[PDB]
Design a protein around this nucleic acid. Structure first.
Lengths: 176, 120, 82, 48, 63, 135
RNA sequence: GCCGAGGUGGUGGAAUUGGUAGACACGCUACCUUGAGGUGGUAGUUUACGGGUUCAAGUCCCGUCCUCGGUACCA
RNA sequence: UGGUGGCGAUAGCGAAGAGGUCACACCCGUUCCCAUACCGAACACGGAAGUUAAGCUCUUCAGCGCCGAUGGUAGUCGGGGGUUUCCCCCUGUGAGAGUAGGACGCCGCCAA
RNA sequence: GGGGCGGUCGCCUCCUAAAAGGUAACGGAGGCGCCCAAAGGUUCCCUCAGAAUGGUUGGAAAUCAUUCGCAGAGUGUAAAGGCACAAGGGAGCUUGACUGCGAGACCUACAAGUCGAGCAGGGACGAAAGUCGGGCUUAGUGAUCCGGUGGUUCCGCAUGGA
RNA sequence: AGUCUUGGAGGUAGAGCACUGAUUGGACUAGGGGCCCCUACCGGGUUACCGAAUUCAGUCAAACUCCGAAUGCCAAUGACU
């Protein structure tokens, strides 16, 4: 709730008069957040899928999809199927809640934390957080952690060029 | 970037899937449905002649409704479709739900035309 | 001298199946008669022509036969009455 | 392996049908409702 | 939203050991935190403890 | 030994030699070239011997520019074997040379040396050939 | 070049897809015994190759290399 | 303007513009119908705070794409001749490539 | 291209094959003697491979978003033909992988083989229109004789049975 | 039955590279070696020693077609013969 009001009131006039848009609708909005999991031990660890079907339901209560491999790879011992990786897409109120979890609460707990990279924008206006330790925001509970499998967060704006997505995500609260 | 295609582009595609299997023949004219945000529209089309025979819209200042986008607006425009289809006597017609479900305002149109006397 | 090498390995071949036009353009054609034996749809069914289970194009009604075209680069059989 | 399957009726007991199935992908005795021309209706059939 | 599949979400009154409170919506109704942002010392400019501690040995000639 | 590294079908028909060449009828990579006045099959070894004669006479070649490559294989049954029982095993590779096809070219070298260089190339070829300047 | 056969540890060599640097007999290494050797006693070292199939590969399959032999030019 | 059709992208792509009171939309939410292998993104159910930026229309233009001659040529039916794994001549036919150019919408129907 | 050896014997796809169809050789290549209870039916949905970037362990290449991609992918399986209105992908519901047929056609010496609108009986899906008599088409198979099994207002050596 | 007019199906000869294979050279070009320097194979420094993928320009194909004949073939339509 609070990040929407922060976004509207503080950000939309400031970003609108910072980048001089020809309409109110050109102002970029964070549309969706995609949480990749990328568990490839489903082949080698048949139970492991429940790991991050267990964990990513607790990471965000939208249950991730047990996603399947679309092409057979012989070097990985894997036919089409044998499902690989979980996936959350996120738009609504929980997503500004999730960036509220990331910015203000979680990103201190990165145990080697510095400026997360400026050079992680694709050239279109979208961002990914590459996570190496799956316990960052306090729900994850070391007690309930054996497999350390991290996470990929894909923050997707509606930005047409890239540095205005930069100036969006700096102003929302992501440090760099 | 992220860009999405329109409702209208996917709607015309999902309509063009529908159009391969039913057309506005003689004595089964095609009863088409368009679903604007603020109104709803319904034509009765011959596809051999390329001519719509009867028509009814909620964009009619006569016999207006308040909400105009409600399911009751769709029921009133469906009975108007069938009423104009009764005044020019086709009496038997084939329902084109146009790239939509058979669910809401479209199903309200269709149920209203089935009640008022268009034999789908 | 006759030094022995054998084993062609390539004798066999399948039996010729007679795909292609069985009726022509402007031909009078009764109902149910095969207009075009094919594999795939090299030519599509148009008006009053049905595509079979072995995707042959057959005529549903009596009438003349026309091979028109489907616009861009694509053909069509259609049977019209008189 | 793939086995030839007769599908005998239950209302009539008459055989009337054959299709094939696996002994491994379908290890149990399979049943369908088909048309019994003695019963002149749709009837549950049964592998025998 | 599918019913019976997702866990619940209540208004999380996220605390911190520095006392700073914040509001989100989570699985947990209330969350206790040991280090928030405003508690973490990197956000608070040049910190007291670790920047006063992280002085390398000044070539201990003294005696 | 110019060899295509891979061929779809190792045994092809012998084809026919009629009509002029589709292309390469004119010299544009080099300065001085050699056309075929007749049609033939030129094997690996004729391009080898001609190109070696070219390189040995020019003694420092600007560019040598071989336009024909032996794509077609020709098969041959072994010696003293009756007819039939399959096509023979492949022995060699052949460039098909239609009439009016620029075979070799020369750049950066004067006209008389190019004449005599393409002449030593021409006496290794089965064809009647002529010298061709750039137009 | 063609056909047929085998390519394991230093050696000869068994292994019907199911655990082998080796399971079996020798060598080999470290120790013991003996004055010092031998015998004897104790412990110890990826299947010609590369790419698959498989939950599992020496094995099943596709290709490359080597050696035995038969089948040829020639002396 | 909005919907719906036929016509071979001469309709396209791409580039630069303009328009909103109506109209189509972008939008605002899910309380019920419905939905999302995840999710009001979609699909549905509703609304009208603002938005001409996008779709949408409406102009130009030949950068890619498309259509595309005439001539000439390769080929070839038929006749003929030669040193005949080929070549030449005659009557008729006649590409492909390349081009000059055409083209960034024509034509219907219905509702405003 | 003497006979033996080798190789082959039936069916499907391409090239030979000469722009209908056909067409031979011990011509060039390949496959078949099946698989699938969903890999069938219908309804509703929807779009592929790669590349460039952002991304731990993730590697050249799993999964992710993100633009560009009317086609290389996919199509159970050789190969051809065909397909993005899907024939390619999902999910629900399902058994038409129905019975009696079948005007008329293709094919062909025959035996055979293939296509078939439509009708009736009963259903499946769908609101309906409709579609469904297996799969994307073409391979996945063999006559008769003799026996087995199941069912039948059939006959049954004088009659009733057998 | 022939021929003229007309409508079709079919993709060879030819041609072209738009697929699929083959393939000549130049331009760059991640990278693989080799001379080595020290040195945790770490960081590099070079070479006209090879180069995957990009581009321009050229070739070729029975099982390659963005294309496409002349003929032959199937017809109808009249016309004669």
């Amino acid at each position: 709730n609070r990040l929407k009001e922060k976004y509207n009131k503080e950000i939309a006039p400031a970003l609108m008069t910072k980048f001089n848009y020809d309409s109110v609708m050109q102002v970029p909005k964070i549309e969706k957040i995609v949480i990749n999991m990328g568990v490839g031990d489903a082949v080698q660890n048949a139970k492991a899928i429940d790991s991050a079907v267990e964990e990513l339901t607790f990471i965000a209560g939208q249950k991730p999809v047990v996603t399947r491999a679309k092409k057979s790879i012989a070097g990985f011992r894997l036919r089409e199927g044998m499902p690989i990786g979980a996936k959350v897409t996120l738009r609504g109120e929980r997503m500004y809640d999730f960036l509220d979890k990331l910015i203000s609460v979680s990103l201190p707990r990165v145990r080697d934390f510095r400026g997360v990279s400026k050079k992680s924008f694709d050239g279109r206006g979208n961002y990914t957080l590459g996570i190496k330790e799956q316990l960052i925001f306090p729900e994850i509970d070391y007690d309930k952690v054996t497999k350390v499998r991290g996470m990929d967060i894909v923050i997707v704006t509606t930005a047409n060029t890239d540095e205005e997505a930069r100036e969006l995500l700096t102003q929302v609260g992501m440090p760099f | 970037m992220i860009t999405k295609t329109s409702k209208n582009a996917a709607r015309l595609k999902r309509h063009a899937r529908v159009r391969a299997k039913l057309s506005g023949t003689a004595e089964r004219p095609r009863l088409n449905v368009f679903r604007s945000n603020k109104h709803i529209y319904a034509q009765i089309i011959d596809d051999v002649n390329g001519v719509t025979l009867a028509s009814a819209s909620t964009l009619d200042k006569d016999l207006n409704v308040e909400s105009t986008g409600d399911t009751s607006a769709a029921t009133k425009v469906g009975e108007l479709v069938a009423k104009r289809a009764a005044e020019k006597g086709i009496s038997d017609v084939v329902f084109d739900r146009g790239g939509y479900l058979y669910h809401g305002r479209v199903k309200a149109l269709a149920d209203a035309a089935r009640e008022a006397g268009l034999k789908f | 001298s006759k030094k022995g090498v054998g084993s062609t390995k390539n004798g066999r071949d399948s039996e010729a199946k007679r795909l292609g036009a069985k009726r022509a353009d402007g031909q009078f054609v009764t109902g149910g008669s095969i207009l075009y034996r094919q594999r795939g749809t090299k030519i599509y069914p148009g008006e009053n022509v049905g595509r079979g289970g072995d995707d042959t194009l057959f005529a549903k009604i009596d009438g003349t036969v026309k091979f028109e075209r489907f616009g861009r680069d694509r053909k069509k059989v259609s049977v019209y009455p008189v | 392996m793939r086995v030839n399957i007769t599908l005998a009726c239950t209302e009539c007991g008459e055989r009337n049908y054959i299709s094939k199935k696996n002994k491994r992908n379908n290890p149990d005795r399979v049943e369908f409702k088909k048309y019994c021309p003695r019963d002149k209706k749709s009837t549950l059939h049964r592998e025998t | 939203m599918k019913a019976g599949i997702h866990p619940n979400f209540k208004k999380a009154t996220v605390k911190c050991a520095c006392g700073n409170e914040f509001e989100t919506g989570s699985v947990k109704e209330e969350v206790r935190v040991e280090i928030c942002s405003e508690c973490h010392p990197f956000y608070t400019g040049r910190q007291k403890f670790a920047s006063a501690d992280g002085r390398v040995d000044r070539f201990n000639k003294k005696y | 030994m110019l060899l295509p590294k891979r061929v779809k079908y190792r045994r092809e028909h012998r084809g026919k030699m009629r009509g002029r060449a589709k292309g390469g009828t004119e010299v544009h990579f080099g300065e001085f070239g050699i056309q075929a006045l007749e049609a033939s099959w030129i094997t690996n070894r004729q391009i080898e011997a001609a190109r070696i004669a070219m390189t040995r006479y020019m003694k420092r070649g600007g560019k040598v520019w071989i336009k024909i490559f032996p794509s077609k294989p020709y098969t041959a049954k072994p010696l003293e074997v009756r007819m039939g029982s399959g096509k023979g095993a492949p022995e060699g590779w052949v460039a098909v040379v239609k009439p009016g096809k620029v075979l070799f070219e020369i750049s950066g070298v004067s006209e008389e040396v190019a004449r005599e260089a393409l002449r030593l190339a021409s006496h290794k070829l089965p064809i009647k050939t002529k010298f061709v300047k750039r137009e």
